[PDB]
Amino acid sequence: TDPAVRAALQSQPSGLNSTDDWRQVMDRIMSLTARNPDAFRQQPQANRLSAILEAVVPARANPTHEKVLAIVNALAENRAIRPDEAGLVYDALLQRVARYNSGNVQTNLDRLVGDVREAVAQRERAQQQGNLGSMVALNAFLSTQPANVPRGQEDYTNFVSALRLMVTETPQSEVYQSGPDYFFQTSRQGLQTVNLSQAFKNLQGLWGVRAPTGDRATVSSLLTPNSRLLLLLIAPFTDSGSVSRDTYLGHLLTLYREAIGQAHVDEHTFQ
Amino acid sequence: KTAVDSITQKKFLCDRTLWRIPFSSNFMSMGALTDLGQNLLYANSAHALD
């Protein structure tokens, strides 16, 4: 339903148009509501009296359950526990509060429901913002890699910046380390996993010397297919002129960029 | 032809039921809470019954 744990909670512990919002009831009971006036003037006696009796002297309520359920629901929507664990932990927290209760505890509980509401919102927006963890992993890997290439350097650093931009600009992409290598998955539960360490090791020898040799397919077999996928995934990035043209790497990047381009364009055209 | 003088007796049987006298103004079931029941509540008045 709603992600805001306050909202996704308050649907559970609440009546409908009771005296929790006193102003609306008091407006409707006299005549003040304009949507349908004289509605309350013509109800049975008991009901009328009862509301009125409720209205003049409100009845106090115990909000402990509401706050505890709010924080429990926040934990559930934030993958702190499984839903069955949610049903259990609600009672657990309820007992915990009930055996240590104090005004200070209620104050801290209100503070906590505010904090968890903010936490859920922040987690969602951060998960849709770019997943800083992948950026950290990529920076660690790049620190592992050397920053100096004896044959050509502008293309190398340009490509490195292009990769950085690619991992930053597309959230849901994963960068991590499983074994003694770093990888790059284009999506959770997704295919196209590139062995980043192996790709860089293979590509180290092709940076500044494959420009004159791009015309002859004599060294074309040096490109392992994993690195070919790695280059393919960066076709939309590293636009023309970023990588020096007339280079085997540059030629491949330009071809892939042109191909992907015709495609998306034609596709948004559809019909 | 020789029928004797007759005197009529009338009686009725109503089993498996209870006579009901609802506490409502017009005797009909207009709701679970009768209107007169509503009138008497909140009156805070005690009454004796015979």
UniProtKB/Swiss-Prot annotation, chain A:
Segments of this protein annotated with the region Peripentonal hexon-tethering domain: 1-101
Additional comment: All late proteins expressed from the major late promoter are produced by alternative splicing and alternative polyadenylation of the same gene giving rise to non-overlapping ORFs. A leader sequence is present in the N-terminus of all these mRNAs and is recognized by the viral shutoff protein to provide expression although conventional translation via ribosome scanning from the cap has been shut off in the host cell.
Posttranslational mods: Cleaved near the C-terminus by the viral protease during virion maturation to form the mature protein.
Binding to hexon-linking protein as annotated region, ranges: 133-246
Organism of origin: Human adenovirus C serotype 5
Annotated localization: Virion; Host nucleus
Function: Structural component of the virion that acts as a cement protein on the capsid exterior and which mediates the interactions between the hexons, including the peripentonal hexons, and reaches all the way to the penton vertices. Two hexon linking proteins IIIa, one from each facet, stabilize the unique edge interface between a pair of facets. As the virus enters the host cell, hexon linking proteins IIIa are shed concomitant with virion acidification in the endosome.
Region Disordered, residue ranges: 1-19
Protein name: Pre-hexon-linking protein IIIa
Modified residues (Phosphothreonine): T269
UniProt modified residues of type Phosphoserine: S220
Quaternary structure (record): Interacts with hexon proteins; this interaction tethers the peripentonal hexons to hexons situated in the facet. Interacts with the penton protein (via N-terminus). Interacts with packaging protein 3; this interaction is required to promote correct genome packaging.
UniProtKB/Swiss-Prot annotation, chain B:
Function: Major capsid protein that self-associates to form 240 hexon trimers, each in the shape of a hexagon, building most of the pseudo T=25 capsid. Assembled into trimeric units with the help of the chaperone shutoff protein. Transported by pre-protein VI to the nucleus where it associates with other structural proteins to form an empty capsid. Might be involved, through its interaction with host dyneins, in the intracellular microtubule-dependent transport of incoming viral capsid to the nucleus.
Residues of the full protein shown: 853 to 902 of 952
Ranges annotated as spanning the membrane: none
Gene designation per UniProt: L3
Extra remark: All late proteins expressed from the major late promoter are produced by alternative splicing and alternative polyadenylation of the same gene giving rise to non-overlapping ORFs. A leader sequence is present in the N-terminus of all these mRNAs and is recognized by the viral shutoff protein to provide expression although conventional translation via ribosome scanning from the cap has been shut off in the host cell.
Induction notes from the record: Expressed in the late phase of the viral replicative cycle.
Protein name listed in UniProt: Hexon protein
Similarity comment text for this entry: Belongs to the adenoviridae hexon protein family.
Subunit-structure text: Homotrimer. Interacts with the capsid vertex protein; this interaction binds the peripentonal hexons to the neighboring penton base. Interacts with the hexon-linking protein; this interaction tethers the hexons surrounding the penton to those situated in the central plate of the facet. Interacts with the hexon-interlacing protein; this interaction lashes the hexons together. Interacts with host dyneins DYNC1LI1 and DYNC1I2; this interaction might be involved in intracellular microtubule-dependent transport of incoming viral capsid.
Lineage: superkingdom: Viruses
Subcellular location: Virion; Host nucleus
